[PDB]
Nucleic acid binder design. Sequence first.
DNA 1: TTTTTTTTTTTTTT
DNA 2: TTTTTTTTTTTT
Lengths: 104, 103, 103, 101
Amino acid sequence: RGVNKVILVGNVGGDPETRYMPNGNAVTNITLATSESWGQQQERTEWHRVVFFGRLAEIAGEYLRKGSQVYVEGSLRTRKWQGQQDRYTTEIVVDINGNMQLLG
Amino acid sequence: ARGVNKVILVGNVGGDPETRYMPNGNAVTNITLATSESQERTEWHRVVFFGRLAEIAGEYLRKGSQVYVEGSLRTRKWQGQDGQDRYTTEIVVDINGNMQLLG
Amino acid sequence: RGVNKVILVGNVGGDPETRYMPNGNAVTNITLATSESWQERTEWHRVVFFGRLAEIAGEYLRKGSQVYVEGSLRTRKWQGQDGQDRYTTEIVVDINGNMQLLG
Amino acid sequence: RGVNKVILVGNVGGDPETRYMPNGNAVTNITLATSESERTEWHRVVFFGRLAEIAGEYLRKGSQVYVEGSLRTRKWQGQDGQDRYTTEIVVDINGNMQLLG
DNA sequence: TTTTTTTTTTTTTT
DNA sequence: TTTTTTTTTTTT
């Protein structure tokens, strides 16, 4: 029994990168900036790695541009890769269980 | 705050919590949190409590406790001992967040 | 386009009621209490489950169960026996929602 | 112990209504439409405190807005002397509001 | 068309 | 009492 939910509203950092997998499913990557309040309650930007799959990846690939404001709802997944050694990347995964809404 | 940055987790604590205090009065509690889905899949989460909830967290949470956590994502950069850049994404729970012991 | 999300953690008011429609689909109703303290203050929520979650909720929830519910708000209009309009806002948990029995 | 959280993104139905309590505190009411495909759902959202001032100052008919609050079902006496209940989304110090666009 | 439960009293860009 | 165009049962 568990719950793994991420909700972000922010601005797309650069144009989305769409790839295709072995069966042809669209996979779209973006970076997303959210602004929090960093002792004078200042400003600070947090950058999020967001990966879409399926129809949302298609929709994100087509309508999201650099600077787009977007609502994103997904689940956290930490991916383990290795370089030359062990590395980790925490991403927000947006698939059938998630949601995306182009705002503006 | 111009964006929204919200994380909601329900899961099981991976080990007894580590609390620590500094010369600010602040309590800082660190835990790991397992969320699962069903093959059966498990995701491991690093969660850091600050302030009042840090005090509440250190006391009542124990290895295996079930807990609701609401916080915000924060990625910290650090140079490893090989000089190479690394990143740690944590869930930060403070005054704008929430914690609820379950069971 | 928009977003309509409700997240509740609370205690089930009574045993669920599960209704089966002529086509075999299930609808399960509960009430769910969430509280805040400062004196108590308990908010009662009407939660309706559809689909696979309706059968799961009907089978595993009982009076007093602690539960996580994720759904969407829906307000229904109806004329009362005095002839006047009334409204009932419910939390609808369907394929887009979630339910986790806690504790 | 429990959790009561509502997150909405939608469009304001009319210009906001703001009133002032005896202690000077602002209270702002809106209705907010969310849709899904196509059926539209209407929500009664009530802002308190600083967010109520911001809401009253910046929201207008048609504004797209993100809102985060708690559900509160309020009992009130109707125009005839019997009971009406209204479930509202209360947005206060524990909630959030963001103008979108 | 009532209930539950119980150890937590100032949210555009990478 | 009207706004706005594509989610069944764990312990690092």
